[PDB]
Design a protein that fits this description.
Elements (H helix, E strand, L loop, with lengths): L1 H9 L7 E2 L7 H11 L12 H9 L16 E2 L1
Parallel strand pairs: 1-2
The protein binds one DNA strand through loops.
DNA sequence: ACAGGATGTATATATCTGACACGTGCCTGGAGACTAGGGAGTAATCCC
């Protein structure tokens, strides 16, 4: 799946809004998988408080419509 | 009025979040020992 995202990210240069969703036990290992294989392009999780949700989604929620985001954050996990 | 398929219930598990709860670093106001000025206690006494 990460290979699919990387291929259609930087062969066809749309490095994309990425949205991986899974059970909430595995996601730290998913963070480690992202951290191994593509820290070249970045990632952003959510775990905790609803206030933490509200503050983190401000530095998440799409910020820019046109290109993809021209982002410092493009993988919601 | 009866048949059929919807929703409802039941017993047992599971995950995941919310609004509480408890736990700890650390300042400053309370406690202790002290003196001495003095308001208060107290006997005395005029007299309303």
């Amino acid at each position: 799946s990460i290979s699919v995202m990387a291929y259609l990210a930087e062969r066809y240069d749309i490095w994309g809004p990425f949205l991986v969703v899974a059970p909430a036990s595995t996601l730290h290992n998913w963070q480690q998988e992202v951290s191994k294989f593509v820290p070249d392009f970045k990632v952003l999780p959510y775990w905790g408080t609803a206030a933490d949700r509200k503050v983190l989604r401000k530095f998440w929620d799409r910020k820019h419509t046109t290109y993809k985001k021209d982002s410092p954050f493009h993988v919601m996990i």
